[PDB]
């Protein structure tokens, strides 16, 4: 242990996310029967938890979903036709002026309009039909941890809510216990890996790679690595693995790059009884932990 | 230079001047299929061109626009309710397993799907509802430069034919004309300005930031130069692509603010000659292209190798 407010904080999100999904329950079997009869013919995310709810909404809804661009509503000032499709909107203050703007336009474009904020006292909740809260408490460390993680949480438990796909809801009941046996399984990654690295590949497939986005950008804020993530098939190296659908085709480049004679760092979920949608999260809430040790051992404060 | 990527950079303006003459019938008709169709959304399947599709199908023609996930149906084995979308499937062959599929599956999920593509023959054109020829020609070079413009350029002209916006139709028809100024123009981009550069920012905003993407694949595929794009808001060398169209206060004023903070700048711009802000990235890219050849070889590397 660290005994850093980053590692403290990301030891709490499998208690955090445990209350927010019991409270959460209800609104979110509410917003899903809802959402059952609008029958969204599209999901825009509002805000790298896009990403992750592009496969999630894809793969589980088959419902096309996309990241807006936020110079569109701000900088060119342009409204979309969003009527009959879904926007979510991410933001943890819920305050910023171009998160309000972009929210404002998707509502009136005739957009059904979800929120997922941690502060519920913000002024997004004026704006949209239904407020999600994160429920992740105050986040002191610079560094985000189990604030992201229970955003993921929160995109999970709509669509399980939404779609009512018995697998995905057995994954939402499961995901406490499974990020709590994160937290307790053997650390992954370790300064050791990194002593001469400058420029990193962090390698993903699916959802994985959505996880991956995440992992570079905490290795350039908390460890001053210049890190960039790029999906297996389109491409040392940090092999994000999840034991999901995408694993024969992630593991063969990985196997070959190693071959070829690529520096790898394997990260992993920690136990093969995760399930698959949870196992992004599992293997984020390991390395939350890891690379705080990992930037002490550079000598930077998390 | 003599390099056969000038070579091909330099023709980029006749070429796409001769793509939008023989396309004009072609688009105009697929222009009236989807006024009738009337999208609700726009999807691109494809290998940057689609970043720069996005912001043109939103902001021309209010449509959200957005990239495909293949490896969905590829590896996750799942289909998308794609019914009333419209379906752009860029390919320079339109010979890729991923394209191909990913045409299927939008086709039989009740999309308008349309193909731009360099290779008219290419067996896309039996699944898709309507193929655009890019008519950029033969690339004998291994930097693509024409076929991208060609590929930006056939996108500009489907959304003049279809929006029938008054501006766009102007910046269209003005297309060749700025490509040519851009050509003419004086040189930006110089070796000198990389001498110490190992990473690189290269900061856009809107359609400027799409096509910084571009600009740092070439620095990184050309030059071996550590280069990653950045939207200018989201934000020690930095390339900073400046487009005088709307994003053009905040974008400067970023630029102004990380100047100041004590940044190393190269300035890029879409040239001295009155140019449409929406042809405007084309013009740098135009411009760039015809520069980072020198740079390449300057820095002793054959960019056709």
Redesign the interface.
């Known amino acids: 242990t660290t005994n850093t407010i980053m590692e403290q904080e990301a030891r709490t999100a499998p208690q955090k996310i445990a209350e927010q999904l019991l409270a959460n329950d209800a609104i979110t079997e509410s917003l899903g029967s809802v959402l059952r009869e609008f029958k969204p013919?599209?999901v825009?995310i509002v805000g790298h938890a896009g990403v992750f709810a592009?496969?999630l909404f894809?793969?589980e809804a088959?419902?096309?979903t996309?990241?807006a661009?936020?110079?569109?509503a701000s900088?060119?000032?342009?409204?979309?036709?969003?009527a009959?499709?879904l926007v979510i909107v991410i933001s943890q203050s819920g305050r910023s002026p171009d998160i309000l703007a972009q929210a404002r336009m998707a509502k009136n474009a005739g957009a059904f309009c979800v929120a997922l904020v941690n502060d519920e006292t913000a002024p997004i909740k004026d704006i949209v039909d239904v407020v999600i809260p994160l429920r992740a408490g105050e986040e002191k460390a610079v560094a985000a941890t189990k604030s992201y993680l229970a955003t993921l949480s929160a995109l999970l438990q709509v669509a399980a809510k939404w779609t009512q796909n018995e697998s995905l809801v057995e994954a939402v009941n499961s995901l406490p216990q499974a990020l709590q046996a994160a937290v307790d399984a053997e650390p992954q990654l370790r300064a050791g890996s990194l002593t001469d690295v400058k420029?990193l590949v962090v390698l993903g497939?699916?959802f994985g790679y959505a996880v991956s986005k995440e992992i570079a950008l905490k290795l350039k804020e908390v460890c001053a690595i210049?890190a960039?993530a790029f999906?297996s098939?389109?491409f040392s190296i940090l092999d994000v693995c999840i034991r999901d659908?995408?694993y024969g085709?992630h593991v063969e480049q990985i196997a070959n790059v190693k071959q070829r004679g690529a520096n790898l760092i394997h990260l992993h979920q920690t136990s093969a009884d995760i399930h698959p949608r949870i196992a992004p999260l599992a293997l984020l809430q390991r390395f939350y932990i890891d690379v705080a040790a990992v930037a002490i051992a550079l000598g930077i404060n998390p």
Do not use: D
């Open positions: 013919k599209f825009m592009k496969y894809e793969i088959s419902i096309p996309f990241a661009a936020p110079s569109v900088v060119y000032g342009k409204t979309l036709k969003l009959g499709g420029n497939r699916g210049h960039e999906s098939a389109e659908e995408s085709s």
